[PDB]
Each structure stands twice: as C-alpha cells, then as structure tokens.
Homo-oligomer: A and B are copies of this chain.
Amino acid sequence: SSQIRQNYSTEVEAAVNRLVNLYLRASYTYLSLGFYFDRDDVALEGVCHFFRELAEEKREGAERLLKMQNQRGGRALFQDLQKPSQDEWGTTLDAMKAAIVLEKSLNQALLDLHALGSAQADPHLCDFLESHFLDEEVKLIKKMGDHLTNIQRLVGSQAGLGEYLFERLTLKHD
C-alpha cells in the first residue's frame, strides 16, 4: 500500500487526481486547436505552433502532478478524457478567447486546490502549487491577454489582413 504517506489527506489525493484529468483535457483541447490551424484552409503556422506548445505544457503539468501524487504516497486514478468542446475553432481571435477561458478554469482549479491544502494544513502541497503552477499560470494568462489586445486592434475593417499580420509579426514561425 504505502509506508510513506504523512499529512496527505484523502481529499487532497482525490483533488489532485481530478486536476490531472483537467490538465490532460486541456492538453487535448490544445492538440485540437493546433491541428485546426495546420489545416490547408486555415494555414496559420504561428497559431498552430502556439497551441501545439501549450498542449505539451499542459501534458507536462499533469505529469508533474502524478509524480507528486506518488511522492506523497497517494494513488493515481485515471478517468475517461472528454473530447474538446469544439471540432473547429473559428478565427485566431475566437481561439485565443477560448484559450483564456480554459486557462482561467485551470487557474481557479489551482486556487481551489491551494485553499484545500491550506485548510488541511498541508504546506508541502501549497508550496508545490506556488512553486510550479500559480506563477506559470499568471504569466500565461498575461501573455494571452496581451495577444487578445493585439488581435483586437488588428481587426479594423480588414480582418484577413490583420489575422495574417498578427501571425507573421507576433507569433513564432519558421
């Protein structure tokens, strides 16, 4: 079973497993976003790359949670992973709006788990989230907000031009 578990509540253990599911769901959403922007009828390489990188980052966050679960003596439990909310993601603007909604949901889940840890007097859990998740999420949401503002300023009366220019001049591409 476990000979190591200490100060690790069943409530935190379950909440960590749920958060793993949320991060893997987010990773899957970003995989879908990335491949949508690689369609020949969409063809925005920088947008594709932005979301493919986020799919990897969310996968890695799930793996860090799972490592920690085992370090604490809890037990990973995996659930079905629901498919993303859309099959087609619209414009870069639509996609970036969906991404910031997703990230705020992950951030609230992190804050909720931190509050549970606080309540349970679990400082290792609280430290873990502070050190590896909370600032990473604030930084990412600030980046997305920056991007949304620039996308919005480029719409003008010439949406296609603006969408090309943002992809070319802000996002990273070959």
- 8 Å CB contact of A160 from B79, B147, B153, B170: B153
Q: A16-31 CB contact bits vs B (8 Å, 1 = yes)?
A: 0000000000001001
The answer to whether A124 and B138 touch (CB under 8 A), given A160-B154, A165-B164, is: yes
Pick the contact of A149 from B41, B69, B87 — CB < 8 Å? B41
Main secondary structure of the interface of A (DSSP, over half): helix
Instruction: Assign chain A's interface to a size class.
Output: 35 or more
Which residue of B has the minimal Cβ distance to A147? B43
Instruction: Tell whether, in the assembled complex, residue B142 and residue A71 are in contact, meaning their CB atoms are under 8 Å apart.
Output: yes
User: Once the chains are docked, how many angstroms separate the CA of A141 from the CA of B162?
Assistant: 26
Given contacts A78-B32, A123-B134, A145-B40, contact A100 B161 (CB under 8 A): no
A168 to B169, CA, bound (A): 7
